[PDB]
Amino acid sequence: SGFRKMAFPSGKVEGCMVQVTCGTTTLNGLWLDDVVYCPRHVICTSEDMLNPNYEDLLIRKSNHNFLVQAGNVQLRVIGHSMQNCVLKLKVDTANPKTPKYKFVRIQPGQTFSVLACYNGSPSGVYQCAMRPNFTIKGSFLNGSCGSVGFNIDYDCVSFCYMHHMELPTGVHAGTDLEGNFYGPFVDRQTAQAAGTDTTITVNVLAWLYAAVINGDRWFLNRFTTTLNDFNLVAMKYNYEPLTQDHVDILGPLSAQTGIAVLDMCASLKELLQNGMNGRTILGSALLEDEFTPFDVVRQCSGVT
């Protein structure tokens, strides 16, 4: 037992990280087959970022202006194209370490691992969730752009995120691997404010089930509630509305613990109204919302 914020093993993604340099700007790229994917803002100078016209800036660039380095070896660029906010650099060598992969666009509330990189080299790995305001709360310094978010299904890596920027508020924004930003964010150095960061209710419930599976049961109460009554309390506390789909998703956790989803909702309702009273749940003094029901089942079963 024990419950930890766990990331997927990162080896498969480490084998794909490369350094992309254009002019004086250096960031990370993801090398899959004979294509290197990187944020398009690699072609900008800090002076361009204020109001960049990427199509115009790109006309000034040729295959030889994009320097791609994997380890200490230089890859030859034989083509370049812009797809939304990402650049695809066709190289002459297929990545020999290319894992089985997919490009997916995740929904808010979904979690993923981030392999934070600098100059194409891995720095660390941590677990994130796509917030309901389409930002992530990462750990990203200057040069981390191009680091990716991913999930693993046995041996297939699903790439879901590519890091592009930090907003003035310190939160992070980026795209899926087709270059489309999550949320209303643009790759421009301009006033961009995030919307309300609500709590991912279904994930809090999944984490409450993980706590009961791990022996932390103090919060379990004698009450029950309805989806409508629960959602009235949830909206008041900036919690996402809970749907019958979320109740269904929690089904296996409800089955394993013998605690009906609506009973767990009433326990959570009392936690919101009464607070934690100086107590902890799985060593946390706040309600954790960055474990999906799938992450909870996965960790408590030992999927490899």
Ligand X SMILES: O=C(Nc1nncn1-c1ccccc1)[C@@H]1COc2ccc(Cl)cc21
Q: Which is the catalytic residue, given 41, 80, 163, 246?
A: 41
Among the listed residues 100, 175, 168, 89, the one whose alpha carbon sits nearest the alpha carbon of residue 130: 175
Residues in 48-107 that interact with ligand X by CB under 6 A: 49
- Sign of the CA dihedral with 249 first, then 253, 258, and 259 last: negative
The yes or no reply on residue 302 touching a copy of itself (CB under 8 A) is yes
Closest separation in Å from C-beta 163 to a copy of itself: 11
Nearer to a copy of itself, 52 or 143 (CB): 143
Choose among a copy of itself, ligand X, none what residue 187 binds, the Cβ cut-off being 5 to 8 Å by kind. Answer: ligand X
Contact 28, 71 (CB under 8 A): no
* Tally of CB atoms within 10 A around 180: 12
Nearer to a copy of itself, 49 or 167 (CB): 167
Helices (H), 10-51: 11-14
- State which of residues 39, 109, 143, 179 lies at the interface with a copy of itself (CB under 8 A): 143
Rounded Cα distance, 51 and 34, in Å: 31
Q: Which is the catalytic residue, given 16, 38, 145, 265?
A: 145
Contact 7, 113 (CB under 8 A): yes
The yes or no reply on residue 300 touching a copy of itself (CB under 8 A) is yes
Closest separation in Å from C-beta 58 to a copy of itself: 28
The yes or no reply on residue 101 touching a copy of itself (CB under 8 A) is no
Q: Which residues contact 81 (CB under 8 A, 6 or more apart)?
A: 87, 88, 90
Active site residue 300: no
Q: Which residues contact 272 (CB under 8 A, 6 or more apart)?
A: 233, 234, 237, 239
Rounded Cα distance, 156 and 101, in Å: 5
Choose among ligand X, a copy of itself, none what residue 241 binds, the Cβ cut-off being 5 to 8 Å by kind. Answer: none
Length of the chain: 304
Contact 10, 151 (CB under 8 A): no
Q: What is the CA angle 35-41-44, rounded to 5?
A: 120
Active site residue 85: no
Nearer to a copy of itself, 27 or 261 (CB): 27
Query: If DSSP states are collapsed to H, E and C, what string results for 98-120?
Result: CCEEEECCCCCCCEEEEEEEECC
Contact 67, 20 (CB under 8 A): yes
The yes or no reply on residue 164 touching ligand X (CB under 6 A) is yes
Burial class (CB in 10 A: 0-12, 13-18, 19+), 206: buried
The yes or no reply on residue 283 touching a copy of itself (CB under 8 A) is yes
Rg of the chain in Å (alpha carbons): 21
Number of residues that bind ligand X (CB under 6 A): 14
Nearer to a copy of itself, 3 or 54 (CB): 3
Of 16-24, 114-122, 162-170, 231-239, the segment contacting ligand X by CB under 6 A is: 162-170
Beta bridge partners of 153: 156
Of 3-11, 66-74, 183-191, 249-257, the segment contacting ligand X by CB under 6 A is: 183-191
Residues in 150-209 that interact with a copy of itself by CB under 8 A: 166, 170-172
Nearer to a copy of itself, 93 or 214 (CB): 214
Nearer to a copy of itself, 220 or 227 (CB): 220
Q: Can you give the binding site for a copy of itself, defined by CB under 8 A?
A: 1-12, 14-15, 115-119, 121-126, 137-141, 143-144, 166, 170-172, 214-215, 275-276, 278, 280, 283-286, 299-304
Residues with a catalytic annotation lie at: 41, 145
Q: Can you give the binding site for ligand X, defined by CB under 6 A?
A: 1, 41, 49, 140-142, 144-145, 164-166, 187-189
